[PDB]
Design a protein around this ligand. Structure first.
Ligand SMILES: C[C@@H]1CN(c2ccc3c(=O)n(-c4ccc(Cl)c5c(NS(C)(=O)=O)nn(C)c45)c([C@H](Cc4cc(F)cc(F)c4)NC(=O)Cn4nc(C(F)F)c5c4C(F)(F)[C@@H]4C[C@H]54)nc3c2)C[C@H](C)O1
Ligand SMILES: C[C@@H]1CN(c2ccc3c(=O)n(-c4ccc(Cl)c5c(NS(C)(=O)=O)nn(C)c45)c([C@H](Cc4cc(F)cc(F)c4)NC(=O)Cn4nc(C(F)F)c5c4C(F)(F)[C@@H]4C[C@H]54)nc3c2)C[C@H](C)O1
Ligand SMILES: C[C@@H]1CN(c2ccc3c(=O)n(-c4ccc(Cl)c5c(NS(C)(=O)=O)nn(C)c45)c([C@H](Cc4cc(F)cc(F)c4)NC(=O)Cn4nc(C(F)F)c5c4C(F)(F)[C@@H]4C[C@H]54)nc3c2)C[C@H](C)O1
Ligand SMILES: C[C@@H]1CN(c2ccc3c(=O)n(-c4ccc(Cl)c5c(NS(C)(=O)=O)nn(C)c45)c([C@H](Cc4cc(F)cc(F)c4)NC(=O)Cn4nc(C(F)F)c5c4C(F)(F)[C@@H]4C[C@H]54)nc3c2)C[C@H](C)O1
Ligand SMILES: C[C@@H]1CN(c2ccc3c(=O)n(-c4ccc(Cl)c5c(NS(C)(=O)=O)nn(C)c45)c([C@H](Cc4cc(F)cc(F)c4)NC(=O)Cn4nc(C(F)F)c5c4C(F)(F)[C@@H]4C[C@H]54)nc3c2)C[C@H](C)O1
Ligand SMILES: C[C@@H]1CN(c2ccc3c(=O)n(-c4ccc(Cl)c5c(NS(C)(=O)=O)nn(C)c45)c([C@H](Cc4cc(F)cc(F)c4)NC(=O)Cn4nc(C(F)F)c5c4C(F)(F)[C@@H]4C[C@H]54)nc3c2)C[C@H](C)O1
Lengths: 214, 219, 214, 219, 219, 214
């Protein structure tokens, strides 16, 4: 990653073994549960495109997801190239070239070039641009890996309301990855709780609803 | 988080994997037992709003509690906006804007804006303001997750007094109430709901006895 | 805590996750065995009152003990207020106020005020004062949690002398938490060892005693 | 490894126990699954040739693979010597010599010589050159350890499409081939070797469908 | 402990949780096997007397050994006071006092006094002096905890020579004796107490054979 | 160890608990498998003779090996003393003395003297000299602990060639610790693989051999 040293300057630092392992293990433990995306984003704080590729290349399995991710990255990179076409020809000696999409993804750029862009004045934040594309792709994967539509999360006749609400927002977390939808919560409650929730009224907070269905 | 460097400057530092994992694991292990709140507050020392959202977003499960937390944050943010309204209309290009409640919550503000506020002179401590809101929400969650009411904690006939007092204060710790209200609950209930053998001993010590004296006398 | 940076100045630092976890785990593993007190004192090196309250608030269970601790703190704080009463009235603009007992305990003081006291020239070491009160209370808890009086640690007829001595000083550790008492060691030995210890003489070292009863 | 200090200088630092253990454990856990290569490259960030040899020498078992690695290194070192021959004959006493391939591999060079090359102005990045050789050797090993050929990955009649695509790209990941060759293999095989029900759905999407569209359609 | 900072000054640093835990765990795992002593000495690198007491006080159990340690410390402290008596009578207010044995042991000295002595110019290394006393006490404890005497280590009839030599030097390592005495024990016992088949082979090598030659010959 | 601080100067640092534990655990897990030697050498980066003695004194068991190591060290130290005899007599006040072999081994030198030698201009690298002697001794131990001669690693009739090659080079690793020997690999292969390897020809790489015997 690129971070600040004790002195105040922006310098490259190796990715730490702790970071590497934490990322591999969260995917081993949780696959593409929604909380894997904020974990990715935090563990890639300050990352270069090289570091982002390292993180993704160390995922064990899930290679269909990783190919979908590559396809998303290539779509965003094409849009980048359409918005920011690069000068064709040899670049001036010693000077910074403009990054294309495959440079942002770390495929056609060197680490030194990535550092140059990310620390230039003004900077071209190629790590953050690439991370945005990766997170867009990972949100698609989350939604796809979600096993159940929110329309089908419905409270069982013996199911505690809190357990139902947990299932509902766990599912909505994934489904929304990539408003009124939350009104399904009352619609999909069981008859005893729905009767209580309807008499409660429509301005009730979730806390009020959960207390009333205790 | 924001930390001091050797030049004396306050600067951004990435949240550590150790911190991230520690928070996820405390919720895995303890759910919303009362000690989760002080652990959250300490693990979020120096946190930006971004970092606070990262910590909450990484909680596994408990999504009903997380939605309740979001509703508490929105309530506090609305009160912030009532107390500290931001003057409407475009502002001078290139200058620092004033944060509204959704800025403090990290929803409508960038990291750079959060750093700018937190290191301004004088600082606008948006991380600490948001943390206060989150802690208010967690207090509500701990009360809701508590499986026992303090009125139902009564000493068993074969129950050691220390075990009863442990249950009593475990339950009271999770209630949401001022210390004045909590300590009044103790004056009203603790001796009253001891078992007959212990209660006769405790009444003889008088209303001035310390807990140490009560526990030693019932050992 | 407040510690020295690489440069030589006293600054506030966040409590580390490692410290937080170590403290919670020693209480989970050992409850109020005597060695928990020196572990507390070392893990709270440099602590502010805020940090000390953090450490205590993260203890799982043992809430009767924690209430006893609060009562001890309030007694010491009252004694503080009796010895160091604070000026009544508004304090001069920009100047340091005097801490009362509830300020030392972190209840009515801010972190910034705690830092100010602890780094002032001369300092008011409110972290160390509060830690003394906490350790006084924890020593009371240790003694109370001790299951057996030292008078009742008596060597069994088949019990190796070393195992007995281990039980004796384990118990004395807790009982003394808050001289001649150690002469109980010979008094409470079994007949075969007592016969050997008495013939050894009264100046014997523990090593000499243990060797002789091997 | 070589790292920057506060005076801005590049200086040697000892390899950490955490790094050493992380590498030994990834080989223990994953053997030569493809992700071992990116993990090796990241854990050897800033490595000298000495450090690279330390990492390889600490691998437990897999000594046939390690001997194959040494043979690849010797092949690359010979090509280095053909492209960049070192002028024969004694050189000026006290001056920096030019590295030959066995110097880059850490066999005939001292640590001090490696530091000298890596921090020279301009640098001779012998750690990065050796690492490239090692990665070429590991690519060969991963292909050899792969238990399946991409031609034998065919969807089972009861196999979820996502599980089949996972197997397909797990296998393709281990093959040693340009991305052009690998993606041609996909165009030639992935739909062709789907099971009848999935294949009829995929053919109807057309050759332009994305993998997301294919996987969603076969769910 | 006392450590160097960037300004070149020796300054106090808090004992780390990692150090604390490492020491408690080595005693949990190994009790007073001989390697506990070098581990104690290394983990107490730079320690003040306060830190040394912290380490000892955190040992779980083994309180007979801990009391023996205190008695050894008091013996050494008394010898310190005989060799380096502190002039009696009040001293100049505000100046550094001289440490007596109980000051070195951390009992009658403050942390500030310990820092003052250890960083004085010239230093009075009270941490190192106390550590020497503790190590003398631990040497006694290791000898006492050893379950075997070197006279009772004799090779079994089916016992590999290497296993016998391992037992022999494990036992000798725990004895409390100069290296001269220990190596004389080896010359007197090791070959003598080998089993008949090994003993005939070892006698033929002669009294000049190395242990490597003895072990290779009896393999 | 002696290492560089953030500022660029060579200073003594305590051995870390992590290093201490890693070394003890690799010997617990692997005894004297060949990879223990490169692990030792890396974990002792920058070590003083004191630190090297610490590392060896913390090995659990294997005390016959450790005595063999001491005997190797004493042989190398005697050779040192023969090559670099020290001045007999009192050394000049305030000046550096010359190390003898037992000084290099940490037996008759203080830590301060070790630091002085290792940081002098020019330096006497007593840590590295001692480490060389230790590694010479550890290589002897590896070879001795190896259970099987390379002459006796022979492929079974049903044994996969890769598994045989693994056994062969695992054994050669240890045997060589302290060229044509690798031609035993074809000699010691089973009849089916030997037939294939001989028809392959004599210039084949190991990769070619392993592929052909798949
Ligand atoms: C000498 C150094 C070079 N070091 C480099 C250098 C550059 C790149 C580098 O640039 N990228 C890189 C980034 C972004 C794009 Cl879009 C491309 C790209 N686009 S393309 C021409 O259309 O295929 N090609 N590459 C190479 C891209 C990649 C990507 C990263 C990735 C992106 C993703 F989204 C999902 C991920 F898991 C990983 N890794 C792969 O691709 C690996 N892989 N291989 C196959 C094929 F066998 F089936 C498959 C993958 C897979 F992605 F895992 C997925 C299952 C399918 N690694 C690299 C590694 C590695 C080191 C060990 O030594
Ligand atoms: C590109 C970056 C951007 N990165 C950002 C940026 C900004 C915000 C960011 O600002 N916030 C944020 C903070 C505070 C407020 Cl009040 C709001 C808000 N108020 S609102 C319009 O009324 O819905 N909206 N958001 C987005 C808010 C949040 C909150 C945080 C949270 C607050 C809480 F209290 C409890 C928590 F566990 C987590 N996370 C969510 O909301 C996720 N979530 N989704 C649903 C729904 F799908 F089912 C549910 C949650 C849930 F909260 F967990 C709860 C179960 C219900 N994350 C963010 C992430 C993520 C990263 C991977 O990539
Ligand atoms: C916004 C911030 C504010 N952050 C603060 C700020 C201030 C204080 C802060 O000042 N203190 C604090 C310090 C010292 C004193 Cl004496 C008092 C005090 N004296 S009093 C008016 O007589 O009750 N009141 N308080 C609040 C005191 C405390 C004490 C500490 C403690 C002292 C003890 F000795 C034993 C401990 F385990 C913990 N924690 C509690 O009290 C918690 N608690 N609650 C009950 C009640 F439900 F049953 C019980 C406890 C219990 F102690 F555990 C025990 C079982 C009984 N935490 C605080 C937390 C928390 C953070 C998450 O967000
Ligand atoms: C005093 C110090 C010196 N410290 C040094 C110094 C220099 C080198 C050093 O330079 N290299 C080094 C690097 C690159 C090349 Cl190509 C050569 C080379 N080419 S060659 C003349 O053709 O054999 N020889 N060496 C020594 C090379 C090596 C290589 C590294 C390696 C490369 C690889 F690719 C795969 C690996 F796992 C490890 N380690 C080995 O070789 C060990 N080994 N031994 C045998 C044989 F016994 F059975 C086998 C191995 C094996 F490789 F594991 C494989 C199973 C076969 N270690 C070194 C160690 C060790 C320390 C403890 O103390
Ligand atoms: C306010 C702070 C003050 N903090 C201090 C301050 C000072 C000292 C401090 O100075 N020392 C200290 C150092 C050296 C000497 Cl020789 C003495 C001494 N000599 S004496 C007058 O003859 O008894 N007295 N003390 C207090 C000494 C000790 C010693 C250390 C020790 C030395 C040993 F060798 C073996 C050890 F395991 C530990 N710890 C004990 O003694 C505890 N203990 N108690 C008993 C008895 F109850 F059963 C027993 C022990 C025992 F030692 F474990 C052993 C089983 C017998 N701790 C201290 C703690 C503790 C913190 C939580 O809060
Ligand atoms: C006050 C400080 C002093 N601190 C010191 C200071 C100095 C030295 C110090 O100098 N060395 C030291 C270094 C090198 C040499 Cl060659 C000698 C030496 N040569 S000799 C006169 O011929 O015996 N004597 N010593 C003391 C030497 C040693 C060696 C190291 C070692 C070298 C080896 F190769 C293999 C190892 F495992 C360890 N440790 C031992 O010897 C321990 N030991 N004891 C016996 C005996 F009981 F059976 C046996 C060992 C054994 F080695 F393990 C092996 C099983 C046989 N430790 C020391 C510790 C320890 C601390 C806790 O407190």
């Amino acid at each position: 990653p690129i971070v600040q040293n004790l002195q105040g300057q922006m310098v490259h630092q190796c990715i730490s073994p702790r970071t590497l392992n934490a990322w591999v293990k969260v995917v081993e433990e949780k696959a593409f549960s929604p909380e894997v995306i904020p974990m990715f984003s935090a563990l890639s704080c300050g990352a270069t495109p090289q570091d982002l590729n390292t993180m993704l290349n160390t995922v064990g399995g899930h290679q269909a997801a990783m190919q979908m991710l590559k396809e998303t990255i290539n779509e965003e990179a094409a849009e980048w190239d359409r918005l920011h076409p690069v000068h064709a020809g040899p670049i001036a000696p010693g000077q910074m070239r403009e990054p294309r999409g495959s440079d942002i993804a770390g495929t056609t750029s060197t680490l030194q070039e990535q550092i140059g862009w990310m620390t230039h004045n003004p900077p071209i934040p190629v790590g953050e641009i690439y991370k945005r594309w990766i997170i867009l792709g990972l949100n698609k994967i989350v939604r796809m890996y979600s096993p159940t539509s929110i329309l089908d999360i419905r409270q069982g006749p013996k199911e505690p309301f809190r357990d139902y609400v947990d299932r509902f927002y766990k599912t909505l977390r994934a489904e929304q990855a990539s408003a009124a939808t939350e009104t399904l919560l009352v619609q999909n409650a069981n008859p005893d709780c729905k009767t209580i929730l309807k008499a409660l009224g429509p301005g009730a907070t979730l806390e009020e609803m959960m207390t009333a269905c205790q």
